[PDB]
């Protein structure tokens, strides 16, 4: 069952898109489904698989992490926190950034090519005394 204008999207990734004329999904606070003709409103929903009838009677249960999905007049769209925001949580991160800031800490890129490159630069420049012989 495809609706008119619908998409499941994050800027990072659009989960689904196009119309879905039926969507079974559990609203955070209440029962949720999709069917045309309801009025525009906004909500968020708890995480879980959302079984939605889509075009040509495609239907699938789509795991939600939960997040705010809403429908404008004539339009349907799905937003969700990729992960529900943790309480406390990033508090621990503030701790780690106060420790880290206070007590030095590092995190490294992985390009072997960068490593090899460094070798190339030291090594390359290395053993260069040649400038003396050079004249100008």
């Amino acid at each position: 069952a495809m609706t008119y204008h619908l998409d499941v999207v994050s800027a990072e990734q659009q989960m689904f898109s196009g119309l879905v004329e039926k969507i079974q999904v559990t609203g955070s606070e209440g029962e949720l489904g999709i069917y045309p003709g309801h009025a525009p409103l906004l909500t968020a929903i708890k995480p879980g698989m959302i079984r939605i009838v889509k075009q040509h009677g495609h239907e699938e249960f789509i795991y939600l992490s939960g997040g705010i999905l809403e429908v404008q007049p004539g339009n349907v769209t799905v937003l969700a926190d990729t992960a529900i925001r943790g309480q406390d949580l990033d508090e621990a991160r503030a701790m780690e950034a106060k420790r880290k800031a206070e007590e030095h800490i590092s995190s490294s890129h992985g390009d072997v090519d960068y490593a090899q490159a460094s070798a190339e630069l030291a090594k390359a420049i290395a053993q260069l005394r040649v400038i003396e012989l050079t004249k100008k």
Binding site: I125, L128, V130, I131, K136
Partner: protein, 157 residues
């Protein structure tokens, strides 16, 4: 330099001086190989420490700018270590700094010049050592007058 003629030079040499066709080529009017030339008589004890010392220091700088000169030429300056970069400033500045006018010199270049006073120089040693004038103009320093004079330039220039 291998010139055995030049050998008997240094060999028999008593006093001597040297000149840099790069420094010349640098368009520097004075154009002597400073890094090169040396005074057997120079003694620090004779010179006190301040002379020996300071001179030593500049020598160090020269060593350094010579030293990285490669690294730049290779890499350009993009990677310049802060401190190094700073020194380099002091460097072009210091080279640029040595130059001053000469009274009789107005012939070649219409510009005159003047006799110089050692103590004033000694001052230069410090302020430069200080890099005392932080805003000091590089172009100003060349073929220039005293820190007071170069300060007058500095006013305009």
């Amino acid at each position: 330099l291998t010139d055995p003629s030049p050998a008997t030079t240094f060999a028999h040499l008593d006093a001597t001086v040297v000149l840099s066709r790069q420094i010349a080529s640098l368009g520097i009017y004075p154009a002597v190989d400073p890094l090169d030339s040396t005074s057997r008589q120079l003694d620090p004890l004779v010179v006190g420490q301040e002379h020996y010392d300071t001179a030593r220091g500049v020598q160090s700088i020269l060593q350094r700018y010579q030293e990285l000169k490669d690294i730049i030429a290779i890499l350009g300056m993009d990677e310049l270590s802060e401190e190094d970069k700073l020194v380099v400033a002091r460097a072009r500045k210091i080279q640029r700094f040595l130059s001053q006018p000469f009274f009789v010199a107005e012939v070649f270049t219409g510009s005159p010049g003047k006799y110089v006073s050692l103590k004033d120089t000694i001052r230069g040693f410090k302020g430069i050592m200080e890099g005392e004038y932080d805003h000091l103009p590089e172009q100003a320093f060349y073929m220039v007058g005293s820190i007071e004079e170069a300060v007058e330039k500095a006013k305009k220039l």
